[PDB]
Symmetry: D2
């Protein structure tokens, strides 16, 4: 219920004249707040009724309600991240909102899991000699986070957010190897180049992205993580938490597939840190 | 209720003779499963009653229950991550367990937040020219994830998991600048060196770690994130999710502190990706 | 005088029929070595005289000389790097060849330096608050190497080989800031996107690449580093050494521009390493 | 012949009283330049003859020559890097000095190569499934540069400047695997921990560092790269160029060891970049 977020999100459901209003509001909400209905209509180039229909369309009671809720909407934080933050919010408010939104998104992802696709992804990785993680920006951090979990699972794990390294590494994969392309939009152009090179190498392509995206269409195994975070507009935040939890399921699954031999391997890995960390 | 996890966790609550049993069990649970009570007692060097007291101490009904629950405990995944996974679990089981455990930990962190410490951390960062994120391993990935969120907030943001880069960068900080040291154990030795250099520079040290740890003792602002994940034994997983959500609260708080000027800055940042990402 | 390298390099100077021969030879030199002149001509689809003209064109005395020098050419190393390595070479041979080639290239770069362009690059960086280094692959390593030299020079220094991070960071630059795009080909597509964003931000674009390339055409200051290494074919090696030495000149120049204040700043930086390094 | 560099370098050859003078001069050369002989002697707490003996010891003709050459010495660049830069130098001067110094150091390294140690290092890497590169700071950039050269040579290549990642990765190495620890000082404490873990894993430890250092003492194969750059005082510059050229020799050697199969592998790697780079 940040009204500016709500407007951006319902642009598609709007009549053509009303969308003109929506985009003008999104562009300079503070000028609207001090505008008359006639000024706004003239600035946007629509009729005054179109203004009021827009207001009712986005769930306001009329013009004054729009201006009131716009004023309550002007929290710089609400343009940083897709959380319903209001102008007056204190840390007590937005810290809980952020946690609650993240908890809700994770609960939704959990509810919509394609368990079969997880099984298939786990099995492909468990038979691979190499697993590679590819992504950019936020998804590049997820890639590196994943490599840190997976390197200990008795295979060779690597992560790259450099598209040239991705392409060159992808063509060296064997058909039994696995690449995981990570993308909240499924639309990063360099990543589609990389994904095609993985396919042409014969290797298994796991896509950690929403369904029906260009990236998902290339997948050997599509994990179909449909987190609703509009990262054409907001900083990716909730989306990369969901990705990391899915990564943890894949790692756990691969660990399950290893023998009892894994335990002593992991003891060795943990023992190597003794010199670097103070004892408890 | 993975019995091997439960044993490792309750070592401290045990009588001295019983702890001998605990450590022998943790070291080779499969030999115990095919041992008689007399064999085990002889192998550990304790009395047979000490065996049965150990069993009752960790909540088993007796010796046979121990062996039964040990057999149910031998899931290689349960030594990879601190999730109550059993030998027989399928993806349907451990995927939900992993999500549920993560949701629970986040709910606990949310419940225990020191809101005042958040306000103080947000305020220090909001007045800084530089914010730097320091950590190793899993906390190094969190550091880089954070730098990707913060670079857009009208300050200079950097992350380092190289301790030499950390030390050299820390001494160049001004008193108004901020460093965030990230650590699930609070005991990484190089990070304590870095934290001391931040203090000696006069800058604000924010520690994203549990309370009562060596790192927390150095903090200007201790965030006191007491996620219960034993990373001397298990892969850090749930702990780094909590850290990232706390990072998101700090970023949101800093964004709130910026003017309405931030919105157009973030529009520019998002607009720069248009050439790199397919349109929706 | 690796004949296969020599052939690839003189493709442009060749008659049309002869180029057919060149490309067939480059593709499978071992089959040529056991071919008759008539077999080769038939396989390539040219006349036998075209074979012999090709041989004389690339400086062989005739067909037998071609086959002899092809056999001497089959050193897997000579396809890895642009060094005149022969099939029979030992470490004593190719270690000196590699050093000598690198020394020669550096001497050539030194001889062709545009000293004025260096002065202008140094001056722009010396007045910047931020300097950023952008490149991919080998040039991404150069970028990170540079950031490690420059962070101590009383400005904010960053390096990115992720094109999404590059674009988002570039649009946040001020007109007084500086970006250095590093490229041996001057033709990396994502880097041209980044370079255009730097220009549109008003900032100074320094290009560390050959003259007359697409990247150089965008430059505010083109450093015109015309190292002759064909990185469409060979691993970049000599090119990135030259780039790093040029980077060192720029850093030295910026250091010269700082006050006597810099000395105590650098003492602090070096002092921060005392805990991390054993005393001498 | 930067006098301050010369003084720092000849501290060891000095009489005890004279060293007091040396360290006072190094600490505040500008106060010395405006001091009388009596003032300086009093400030340092030595006799006036000790002043003049110090001057003659470092090759000055007397007190006035010291002050003259100190004034010529105050180039902030000369404390940044170990190049004989003077206060009056222009880009034309220090660009050539930097190239010439680098060329000289490379020529010295070339002259002192232990060719046998190179052969042994090449052979160990050529039989490895994994090669890992470990270093910090400047040597961490060298490590990542190396991984970019080596990943294409039909083995698994990784680089780490995070000491925790180094330790955990090192203990997972097999005896046939190889780690290369890179260090200009040979004294980085975390790197000695990593090197010991490599030895205890049974793997081959190649040290790319000077002889007679703590790191070199651990080596399976010591490459003995005795570049004279004092990185307790100066930015590492010339040292990391030498390391990278040695890395190139090792890569070339490993490429030589691969079949003729490597050529088509490298064609594939280079072909993967076609979509990412504009055609020539
Ligand atoms: O930092 C931001 O605002 C971004 O959206 C970066 C963006 O390119 C992302 O993080 C990379 O994109 P995808 O995950 O491929 O959709
Ligand atoms: O990967 C693992 O198993 C670790 O525990 C690495 C470990 O050093 C950690 O990720 C760095 O430690 P802290 O967060 O400082 O407690
Ligand atoms: O590793 C190789 O074989 C490359 O050529 C990678 C390549 O894209 C380069 O390193 C990045 O290209 P530029 O420096 O932009 O010409
Ligand atoms: O950047 C500098 O001034 C340094 O000396 C960093 C320093 O720790 C070095 O780069 C890491 O050390 P070594 O190569 O191990 O001797």
């Amino acid at each position: 219920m940040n009204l500016l977020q709500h407007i951006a999100q319902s642009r598609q459901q709007l009549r053509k004249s009303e969308l003109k209003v929506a985009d003008h509001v999104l562009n300079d909400p503070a000028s609207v707040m001090h505008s008359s209905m006639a000024e706004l209509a003239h600035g946007v180039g629509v009729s005054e009724p179109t203004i009021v229909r827009f207001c009712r369309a986005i769930g306001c009671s009329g013009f004054q309600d729009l201006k009131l809720k716009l004023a309550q909407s002007l929290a710089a934080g609400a343009s940083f991240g897709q959380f319903s933050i209001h102008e007056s919010d204190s840390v007590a408010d937005f810290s809980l909102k952020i946690f609650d939104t993240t908890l809700h998104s994770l609960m939704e992802v959990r509810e919509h899991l394609d368990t079969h696709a997880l099984e298939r992804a786990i099995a492909a990785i468990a038979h691979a000699q190499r697993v590679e993680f590819y992504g950019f920006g936020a998804s590049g951090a997820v890639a590196s986070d994943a490599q840190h979990k997976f390197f200990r699972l008795l295979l060779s794990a690597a992560a790259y957010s450099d598209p040239h390294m991705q392409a060159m590494s992808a063509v060296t994969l064997k058909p039994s190897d696995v690449a995981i392309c990570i993308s909240q939009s499924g639309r990063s152009k360099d990543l589609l180049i990389t994904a095609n090179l993985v396919r042409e190498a014969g290797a298994t392509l796991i896509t950690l992205c929403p369904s029906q995206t260009p990236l998902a269409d290339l997948a050997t195994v599509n994990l179909a993580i449909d987190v609703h975070e509009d990262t054409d507009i907001y900083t990716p935040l909730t989306s990369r938490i969901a990705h990391l939890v899915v990564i943890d399921v894949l790692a756990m699954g691969v660990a399950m597939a290893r023998g009892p031999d894994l335990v002593n391997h992991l003891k060795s890995v943990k023992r190597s840190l003794r010199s670097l960390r103070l004892s408890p």
